Amino acid sequence: FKEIESHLVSATARKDAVEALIAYFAYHRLFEALFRCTLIEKEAYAAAAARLERCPEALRLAVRHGVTTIRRKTARAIIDHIVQVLPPLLAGYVKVLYEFLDNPASAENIAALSGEGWEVCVDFCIDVLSRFGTHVAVDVLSCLYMLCIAHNAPIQRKADRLPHVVIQLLQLRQMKIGELQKMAFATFNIVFQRMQAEDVALCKTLVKQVVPLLSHWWQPMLNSIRDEMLKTLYGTRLYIQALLREESFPQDVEELLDTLWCDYSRREERARLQLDDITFTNMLLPPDHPRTGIFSLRPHHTAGEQNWALLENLAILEAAYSKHNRVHQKLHSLDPAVRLSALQLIPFLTRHKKPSLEDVAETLEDLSKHVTAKQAIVASWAMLACSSLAIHEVSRHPSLSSSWKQLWQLAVRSLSLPPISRASCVLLNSILKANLIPRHELADDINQIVTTADISGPAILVDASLGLMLNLLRFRNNMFPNASQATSNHIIRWVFVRWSPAELTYASLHGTHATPYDLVNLLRACYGISPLVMAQPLRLFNGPIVLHWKEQAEMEPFIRYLLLLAGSNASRRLALELFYPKVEELQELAESWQVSMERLRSMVLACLTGALLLPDLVNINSSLSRDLESAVFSIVDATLKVILNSPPSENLFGMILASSAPYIPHLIEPELIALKRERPHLLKFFGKLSEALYERSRRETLPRRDILLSYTPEAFYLETSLRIHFLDIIRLNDGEIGRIPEPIINQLAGLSGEQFLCCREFMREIFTSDAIVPLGGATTILETAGHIVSRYEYACCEVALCNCIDIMDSFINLWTDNHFDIAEMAGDLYHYLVKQSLPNNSMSAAAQIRLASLLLHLLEVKSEYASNLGLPSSQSTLLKILQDGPMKLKHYIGLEIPKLFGLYVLKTHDDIFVDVLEHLPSDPDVVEGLAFRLFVLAELACRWPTLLRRSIYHTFEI
Numbered sequence: 001f002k003e004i005e006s007h008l009v010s011a012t013a014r015k016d017a018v019e020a021l022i023a024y025f026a027y028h029r030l031f032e033a034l035f036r037c038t039l040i041e042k043e044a045y046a047a048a049a050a051r052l053e054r055c056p057e058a059l060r061l062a063v064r065h066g067v068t069t070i071r072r073k074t075a076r077a078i079i080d081h082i083v084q085v086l087p088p089l090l091a092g093y094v095k096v097l098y099e100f101l102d103n104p105a106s107a108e109n110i111a112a113l114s115g116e117g118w119e120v121c122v123d124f125c126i127d128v129l130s131r132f133g134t135h136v137a138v139d140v141l142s143c144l145y146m147l148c149i150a151h152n153a154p155i156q157r158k159a160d161r162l163p164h165v166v167i168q169l170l171q172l173r174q175m176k177i178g179e180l181q182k183m184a185f186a187t188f189n190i191v192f193q194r195m196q197a198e199d200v201a202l203c204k205t206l207v208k209q210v211v212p213l214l215s216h217w218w219q220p221m222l223n224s225i226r227d228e229m230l231k232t233l234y235g236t237r238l239y240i241q242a243l244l245r246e247e248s249f250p251q252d253v254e255e256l257l258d259t260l261w262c263d264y265s266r267r268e269e270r271a272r273l274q275l276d277d278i279t280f281t282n283m284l285l286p287p288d289h290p291r292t293g294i295f296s297l298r299p300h301h302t303a304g305e306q307n308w309a310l311l312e313n314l315a316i317l318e319a320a321y322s323k324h325n326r327v328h329q330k331l332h333s334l335d336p337a338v339r340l341s342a343l344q345l346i347p348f349l350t351r352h353k354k355p356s357l358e359d360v361a362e363t364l365e366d367l368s369k370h371v372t373a374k375q376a377i378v379a380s381w382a383m384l385a386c387s388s389l390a391i392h393e394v395s396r397h398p399s400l401s402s403s404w405k406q407l408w409q410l411a412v413r414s415l416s417l418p419p420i421s422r423a424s425c426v427l428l429n430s431i432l433k434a435n436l437i438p439r440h441e442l443a444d445d446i447n448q449i450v451t452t453a454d455i456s457g458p459a460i461l462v463d464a465s466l467g468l469m470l471n472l473l474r475f476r477n478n479m480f481p482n483a484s485q486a487t488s489n490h491i492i493r494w495v496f497v498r499w500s501p502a503e504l505t506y507a508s509l510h511g512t513h514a515t516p517y518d519l520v521n522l523l524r525a526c527y528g529i530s531p532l533v534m535a536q537p538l539r540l541f542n543g544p545i546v547l548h549w550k551e552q553a554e555m556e557p558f559i560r561y562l563l564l565l566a567g568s569n570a571s572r573r574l575a576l577e578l579f580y581p582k583v584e585e586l587q588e589l590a591e592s593w594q595v596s597m598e599r600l601r602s603m604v605l606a607c608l609t610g611a612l613l614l615p616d617l618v619n620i621n622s623s624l625s626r627d628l629e630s631a632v633f634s635i636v637d638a639t640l641k642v643i644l645n646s647p648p649s650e651n652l653f654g655m656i657l658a659s660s661a662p663y664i665p666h667l668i669e670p671e672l673i674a675l676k677r678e679r680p681h682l683l684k685f686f687g688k689l690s691e692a693l694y695e696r697s698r699r700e701t702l703p704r705r706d707i708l709l710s711y712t713p714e715a716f717y718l719e720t721s722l723r724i725h726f727l728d729i730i731r732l733n734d735g736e737i738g739r740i741p742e743p744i745i746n747q748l749a750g751l752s753g754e755q756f757l758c759c760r761e762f763m764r765e766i767f768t769s770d771a772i773v774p775l776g777g778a779t780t781i782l783e784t785a786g787h788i789v790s791r792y793e794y795a796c797c798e799v800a801l802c803n804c805i806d807i808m809d810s811f812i813n814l815w816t817d818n819h820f821d822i823a824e825m826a827g828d829l830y831h832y833l834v835k836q837s838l839p840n841n842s843m844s845a846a847a848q849i850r851l852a853s854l855l856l857h858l859l860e861v862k863s864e865y866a867s868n869l870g871l872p873s874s875q876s877t878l879l880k881i882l883q884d885g886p887m888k889l890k891h892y893i894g895l896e897i898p899k900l901f902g903l904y905v906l907k908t909h910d911d912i913f914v915d916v917l918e919h920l921p922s923d924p925d926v927v928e929g930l931a932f933r934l935f936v937l938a939e940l941a942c943r944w945p946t947l948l949r950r951s952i953y954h955t956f957e958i
Contacts, residue, residue, distance in 0.1 A: 005030060008037035014051060018058045025061040028074050034059045035081045042085060049088070056092035064099045071792065072109055075100070079110075079117055083124055091136050094128075097121070098139050101146040104705060105793040108150045112796070113840055115154035122147055122158050126165050134175075141169075141183040148190045151706070151798045151844035155194045163191055163206055170213055177221055185228035192235050193551065197558055197887045198928050207239040208249060215256035220263040223306075227545060230309045234549050237313065238556070241320040242563045253321055260314050261330065265337040273311060273344060275380060277304035280426055281463040281515055283662065286537035288550060292347045293388045294426065298512075300658045302543040302713065309545045315348035328359075331366060340378060343370065346385035350392075360394045364403055371410045376419035383411060383423040387430035395436060404436045412445050412456060421460040422513070429468045432475070443479060450476055450487055453494040461498035462513035466522045469494065473525060488526040488571045495522060496578040502589045507602035516608040517662060523575060523613060528568045532612070538662050541716040547708050558891050562931055569620070576617045576624055583610060583631045590638035600642065601655050607636045607685070608660065614681040629681070636685060640692045653696070654713070657720040660689065664723050668769045669738035672730055683731045690728035693721055701754045705797045707846040715758040722747065722762050739772040749784050756788060760803040767810035778811050779822050786829050801837065801847035804829065809854050816862040827869050834866070834877055848881060848889045856896060859903055875900070879919040887932065890921075894936035898943040909946045917954065930958060 004020060007013030014037065038055040041048070063070075063078065078100065082093050101107045101121075111118050125144040129137065144166075147153060155162070170184045188210070195203060214229060243249050264272075278295035290297045290308055297308050318327060327349065331342045346363070355363075367389075370382040386407055389395060395404075408431055414424040431437055449456045450472050458465035469491060476487045499519065500506045521531055542550070586606055610632040618625045643652045663682060665671045675683060703712050710719070722744070729741045748756075748763065763781070767773065773781075785807045794800035808826060815823035833851060837843055843851065855874045858865060866874045878900075882893050897916065901909055920936065921929030934955060941951030 001030065005033040008033045009040060011047070011051065014041065014055070018051075018054050021058040021061065025058075025065060027062065027066040027069070028077070030062065031059075031074065031078065034062070035077075035085075038089075039085055042089075052089050053092060056089060056096060060092060060096040060099055063096050067100060067103050067106065070100075070106070072112065075106065075110055076117055079120060083120060090133060091139075094136050094139050094143070097124075098143050098146070101143050104146075104149075105797060107147050108152065108796040109792060111150050111153045112842060115157065115841065118147065118150075118153060119158050122162065126158070126162060129165050129169060130161075132169075138179045138183070141166075141180060141187065145183050145187045145190070148187050150796075151846065152796060152842060154841065155191060156198065159191070159195055159199070159202075163188070163195075163202065166191070167206060167210055167213070170210075170217070173216060177217075177219075177225060181217060182221070182225055182228055185225070185232055189228065189231050189235060189548070192232075194886075196235065196552070197555060197562060197891075200562060200928065204239055204243065207236050208243065211236070211240065211249065211256060212252050215252070215259045218259055218263060220259075220266065226310075227306060230306065230313060230545055231548050233313045233317075234309070234545070235552060237316055238559050238563060238565070240317060241323075242565055244320060244324045245565070250321075250324070253317070254326075257314070257317060257321060257326065260310065260317075261338070261341065264310060264314070265335070265341045268337065269377070271307065272340075273304070273307035275422070276512060277301055277307065279463055279513070280422075280467060281518055282467060283515070283517055284534050284537055286540070288553060289540075290546060293351050293391060294347060294384065294430065297546075299538060299540045302541070305543045305545045311345060311348050315345060315351070318345070319349055319353045322353075325359075328363065331363070336378075339370070340381065343367075343378065343381040343385055347388035350388050355392075355394060357394055357397055357399070360389060360392065361400045361403075364389055364400060364407075368403060368406050368410065371407065371414075379414070380420045380423035383407075383414075383420070383427045387423075387427045390427075390430045390436060391434055395434065401436070404431060405441065407431070408437060408442065408445075412449075415449070415456050416459045418460050421458055422462050422464050422510075425458050425462075425464040425468045429464065429471055432468075432471050439479070446472055446475055450490055453490050453497075457494055457498075459498070460510055461495070462510050463515065463518055465498070466514070466518040470522050470525055473522075485567055485570065488528075489574055491522070491526045492571060492575045492578060495519070495526075496575070496582070499582070501582065501602045501606040502586050504599075508596075508598040511598055511602040511605065514605070515662075516605055516612055519609050520612040524616065527572050527575070527616060529616065533665075534662070536666055539664075539716065539719070540661075540711075541713045542711050547704075547706075547711060550708060550711070551706070555888060555891060558887075558935070561935065562928070572617060573620050573622065576620050576622075576628070579617070580624055580628060580631075582606070583628065583635065587631050587635050587638070590635050590642075593642055594638065595642070597650065597652075597655065600639070600652060601659065603635065603639055604656055604659055607632060607639060608663070610635070611681045611685045612663070612679065615679060632681075633684065633688075636688055640688055644692055644696055653693075654717065656689065657717055657724075660685075660724075661716075661720050664720070664727065667723065667726060667766055669771070672727075672737050675727070676731070676734070683727065686724055686727045687731055690724045693724060702757065702799070705799050707798060707802055709757060709799050710761040715761070718755055718758045719762040722759055726766070738770070740766060740774070740777060742774060742777070745774070745777045745781065749780050753788055753791070753794065756784065757799045757803055760799075760806060763803075764806055764810065767807070773811075775821070778814060779825070782807060782811070782822060782825050782829075786825065789829075790832075795837075796842050798844040798846050801833075801843055802850045805833070805847070805850040805854050809850075809857060812854075812857060812861055816858070816865055830866070830869065831871065834871060838877075838881070845886045845888045848885055849892045852878060852881060852889065852893050852896075856899065859900070863903065879916060882916075883919040883921075887928065890932055891935075894932065894939060897936060898940050901940075901944055901947070906946065909944070910950065913940070913947050913950055922958070933958070 001020075004013075004017040007017050009032075034055060038052070038059070041051055041055060045052075078096065082096060086093060107118075110121070122144065125140050125147070128140045129144070132140070148155070166184055166187050170181065175181075192203065192206070210232070214232065217225070218229060240253065244253060277298055279298045280295050285291070285296060285299065290312065292312075298304065327342060327345065330338055333339055333342065346367075364386065367382050367386045371379055371386065373379045373382060390404070390407075407427060411424040411427040414420055415428075432442070445456070449458075450469075458468055473487055473491055477484050480487075499514075501511070517532060517534065524530055524532070586603060590603065614629060614632065617628060643656060646652055664686075665675055702709065703714055709715055725747065726741070726744055729743055730737055733741065744766075748759070751759070785804050788794050789800050789804045808829060811822070811826075814820055815826035833843075838848075838851070855878045858874050862868075864873065866872060866877065871877075878893070882890060882897070885893075900916075901912060904912060920933045922933060923929055937951045937955050940947050941955075
């Protein structure tokens with residue numbers, strides 16, 4: 001290689017050196033060799049062509065092998081060589097670029113001190129495209145995209161020609177479909193997400209251009225292309241509603257509406273938003289979840305998000321087009337698939353249409369026409385649409401009251417067919433909650449349902465069946481207080497007649513619908529004890545579409561502004577008798593196993609339901625107690641042993657964690673005390689699960705670098721594993737509550753650089769909670785969390801910075817109390833983040849937000865720490881950040897700045913207000929700046945009355 005290095009910088013030397021390199025496949029020197037060798041051959045211009053094609057092939061194969069131990073010096077060197085040698089060698093050089101950018105930390109660390117080199121690369125690719133091989137063109141758009149996904153990529157500078165380039169390319173209505181269009185739409189999404197609240201004019205023009213081009217490349221791979229176009233529609237959802245309120249665009253948008261309808265209506269039954277992609281359960285799902293009026297997207301469904309995305313976006317664009325009745329016409333359509341699609345689009349749309357009395361009445365008449373459609377699909381969806389409309393204030397008008405009776409009627413009989421036993425139940429429940437029919441017309445039918453329970457019972461025992469049965473139990477303990485054991489005993493009989501877990505039709509068809517939460521809540525009601533607690537939002541993971549929507553979710557108010565738009569013992573023994581056979585049959589089915597997803601999931605839901613109500617069914621103590629516990633836990637053990645010895649491709653542990661999570665508590669001391677007092681059998685379950693986890697680990701990089709990495713499947717599984725470990729240790733120690741168990745910390749500080757970032761939400765959750773941590777605990781945790789941030793592969797990534805800021809925030813009051821051993825570490829890290837990380841153009845938007853929160857919290861504890869360490873004051877850093885920062889950070893701070901005036905005596909508020917206003921945006925050519933200024937002044941005013949005078953004065957001033 002040394003003599004070969006001299007050989008490169010005589011064809012037997014060059015071609016031979018490249019052959020020896022290919023055989024091969026500090027570095028800086030060989031890289032110089034290759035560069036100047038290609039240059040010597042370039043000036044020394046078919047053999048010439050072959051040697052030119054073959055030298056940077058060796059180059060690119062070297063940049064796929066030292067691209068790990070490369071640094072910014074070698075980065076700039078390679079980049080300037082690529083842009084200097086070329087004024088033939090397109091594909092080789094572009095390949096070197098592609099393989100240099102494939103490593104994300106590379107294209108992020110080039111977004112350092114200036115953006116000179118980043119702009120060099122982006123302009124390289126823009127010029128290359130605007131010249132436009134064809135596959136090389138795809139690689140050009142790919143490396144352009146790979147540059148644009150860097151949340152500290154300075155885009156605003158080279159943001160004039162870039163979108164026009166990308167969406168000028170796409171206007172070509174040929175080159176049937178491939179990576180080209182997927183990458184076109186990916187760069188569009190990212191650049192638009194940047195420039196969504198800066199350069200409003202550019203954006204309105206762009207959307208006026210890409211609402212047409214979207215109604216063409218939606219020709220009815222294609223999975224990912226429909227996904228990118230649905231993300232695009234999620235973005236543009238506001239410019240469309242603004243433009244329609246401001247005349248080609250109406251024609252174009254209507255044509256696009258009809259392309260969406262024509263595409264969705266020929267999707268007959270497999271992938272058409274099946275009725276198993278929604279749940280009617282009354283759990284505490286998080287607020288940012290996707291939901292519509294009655295149902296909501298089934299948790300942990302990364303496979304049914306595209307259909308919900310399409311229907312959600314279509315409902316929004318339709319209620320935003322009929323604003324400036326396509327749906328009722330399509331409802332009276334002829335082709336049955338069109339009527340089915342118009343039956344699906346009723347709840348999504350009524351979530352935001354605010355219909356009038358005539359429209360509600362008419363649509364309801366037609367739906368009562370469609371309810372009896374002899375068809376599981378159509379009758380079901382029709383009843384769901386009806387029960388979506390039945391939850392207004394418009395529906396409670398007498399002009400259609402008998403109509404409700406009709407629908408009630410058309411459901412009271414439609415309860416015994418397992419095809420439509422779910423939707424029908426929903427309907428009943430809806431009418432029994434909104435009170436559209438008085439409490440004497442509907443008493444005989446309820447008596448029939450609850451006393452008979454074999455005809456006009458909810459034939460299937462799913463989420464909505466249990467909801468309705470609970471509402472009926474309460475109705476009948478409210479009207480006929482005498483004969484309440486009748487209700488409770490009929491209820492228990494129905495529950496244990498319908499709940500057959502160890503059967504193929506149940507376990508495979510509607511096993512996913514029914515959850516242990518609903519079962520045990522109904523049973524605890526009919527005994528008479530109490531609900532399950534479930535006092536916090538469920539934890540779940542999502543897929544790309546919903547995550548991307550969760551990115552553009554905090555900033556939608558600023559875009560709606562910038563755009564200007566003893567008997568109990570009888571019943572318990574009854575239930576125990578009726579229940580034990582279920583466990584016996586389950587244990588026989590389990591002994592046979594020493595297998596699919598559905599049978600195994602049903603068995604684990606059954607063992608959860610068993611472990612939940614053991615503390616119920618032991619006060620019986622009629623010798624069917626010991627046997628019951630031993631049998632339940634024998635099922636649990638057999639299940640775990642099927643789970644372990646299995647391929648990690650089914651991912652059964654995904655199933656068990658996803659099912660068992662909603663019962664894991666919050667990790668504070670009082671809740672972990674009430675888990676040792678009320679539900680201990682759940683704790684024994686969690687112990688067995690922890691053992692299986694430990695052992696499966698004994699047997700054997702980053703999916704996304706956003707702030708949302710902790711909502712992807714990988715992160716959810718890691719956080720759940722560690723909460724399970726935590727609960728197990730707490731059970732065993734029995735008094736080591738709260739005090740973070742040193743084994744848990746040693747499992748925290750014994751992970752990889754890819755996982756410490758994944759479990760950061762778990763670290764936040766434990767540490768923020770009041771919990772004695774060992775000295776070495778906080779010290780070691782902070783040592784490792786800091787070490788992640790100084791590796792040149794994480795020095796720029798968003799997630800590492802956010803995580804180290806959060807961990808410093810967790811122990812805010814150790815270093816700012818005394819001088820410990822940790823105070824030096826936090827000093828070093830504060831200094832590196834403030835003085836060094838921030839002006840280097842390395843902190844991203846979410847990193848700057850997390851640092852703003854760190855500072856705003858620091859002022860409430862020390863308020864001068866940054867001086868006693870030798871830096872400018874914290875407030876100085878905060879406002880310096882406010883002046884220069886991507887509008888997302890400006891919005892966050894302006895929203896949480898009116899809390900900065902809570903740490904100061906009332907005498908000095910106009911002084912602080914002068915100081916702040918010194919650091920706002922103000923320039924007449926920039927209208928976004930003035931918009932932000934008026935925004936923050938309105939916020940201060942609407943919170944602090946002291947600053948109302950100056951807020952109004954400066955609002956009228958500009």
